[PDB]
Amino acid sequence: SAGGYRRKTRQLLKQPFRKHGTPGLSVYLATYRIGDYVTISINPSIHKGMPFKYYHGRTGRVFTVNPKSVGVVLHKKVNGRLSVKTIFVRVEHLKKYKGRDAFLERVNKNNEILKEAREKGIKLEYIRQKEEGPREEFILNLDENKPVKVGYEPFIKVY
């Protein structure tokens, strides 16, 4: 626990139970382009291209693609401000960030509603995410629903 490159890693760089071994082919078949969104997860079975332990699990953006490295931009919290960092990692340490898929589907579907309303004279009725407000009203039936009486009950010791 002195100040080194790999300090205090006992449960962060341990491979989980019944999952040892070299990774598979579905990692290597993926591609990355400039402007995507990528999270970082260390696979502790290769020793060429590991980043520092601080960046384990933070999402960034991809700006360059090299023959052996990918470039990711991030944000670190140095004493006062929020700065800008760049790192080069290998392909076996990344993962495609989901979470824009429900957003990018909403872009493609709203773009279709705008197109069909050009042929008509109506105003646009876009798709936006729902809101939750006060509790709405409902209707209960007392034909098949019977109330159950609830009351207190005397205390009984466990033995």
Partner 1 sequence: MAKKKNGTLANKNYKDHRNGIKRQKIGKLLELPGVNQKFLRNMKYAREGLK
Partner RNA sequence: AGUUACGGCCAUAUCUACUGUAAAACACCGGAACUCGUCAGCUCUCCGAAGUUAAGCCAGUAAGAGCCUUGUGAGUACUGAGAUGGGAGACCGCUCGGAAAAGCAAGGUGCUGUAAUU
Partner RNA sequence: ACCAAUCGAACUGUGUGGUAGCUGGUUCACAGCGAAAUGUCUCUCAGGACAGCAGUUAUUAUUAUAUAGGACAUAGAUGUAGGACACUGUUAUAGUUAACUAUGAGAAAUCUUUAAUUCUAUGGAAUUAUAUAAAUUAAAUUUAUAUAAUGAAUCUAUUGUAUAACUAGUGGGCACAUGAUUGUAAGAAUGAUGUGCAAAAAGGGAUGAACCUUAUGAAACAUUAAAUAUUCUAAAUAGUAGAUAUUAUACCAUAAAUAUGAUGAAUACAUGUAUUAUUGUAUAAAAUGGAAGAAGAUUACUACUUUUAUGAGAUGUUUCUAA
Partner RNA sequence: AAAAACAUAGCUUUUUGUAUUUACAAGAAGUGAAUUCUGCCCAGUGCAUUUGUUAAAGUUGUGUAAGCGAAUGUAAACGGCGGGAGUACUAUGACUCUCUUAAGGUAGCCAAAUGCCUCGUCAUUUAAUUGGUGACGCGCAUGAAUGGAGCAACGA
Partner RNA sequence: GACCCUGUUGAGCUUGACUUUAGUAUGUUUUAAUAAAUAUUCGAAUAUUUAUUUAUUAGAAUAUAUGGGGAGUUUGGCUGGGGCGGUACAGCUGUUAAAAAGUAACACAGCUGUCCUAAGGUAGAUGAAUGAUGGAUGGUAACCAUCAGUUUAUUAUAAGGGAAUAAAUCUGCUUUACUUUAUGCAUAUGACUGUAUUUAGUAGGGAAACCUUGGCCUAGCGAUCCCAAUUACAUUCAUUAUGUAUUGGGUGAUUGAAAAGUUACCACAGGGAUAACUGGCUUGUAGCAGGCAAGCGAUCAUAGCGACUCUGCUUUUUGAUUCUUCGAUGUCGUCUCUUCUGAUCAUCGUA
* Binding positions for partner 1, rule: CB under 8 A: 34-35, 61, 63-66, 71, 73, 75, 79-84, 86, 88
Q: What is the largest CA-CA distance in the chain?
A: 80
CB of 57 to RNA, least distance (A): 4
Residue 37's binding partner out of partner 1, RNA, none, with CB under 5 to 8 Å set by partner kind: RNA
Residues in CB range of 96: below 8 A, 6 or more apart: 30, 36, 37, 38, 39
Nearer to RNA, 11 or 141 (CB): 11
Q: Which residue has the tokens 């207190």?
A: 152
Determine the Cα–Cα distance for residues 46 and 43; give it in Å rounded to an integer: 7
Residue 63's binding partner out of partner 1, RNA, none, with CB under 5 to 8 Å set by partner kind: partner 1
Residue 135's binding partner out of partner 1, RNA, none, with CB under 5 to 8 Å set by partner kind: none
Nearer to RNA, 29 or 139 (CB): 29
Task: Tell me which residue of 48, 52, 38, 54 sits closest to 95, measured CA to CA.
Answer: 38
Do residues 57 and 93 lie in contact, with contact meaning Cβ atoms separated by under 8 Å? no
Residue 110's binding partner out of partner 1, RNA, none, with CB under 5 to 8 Å set by partner kind: RNA
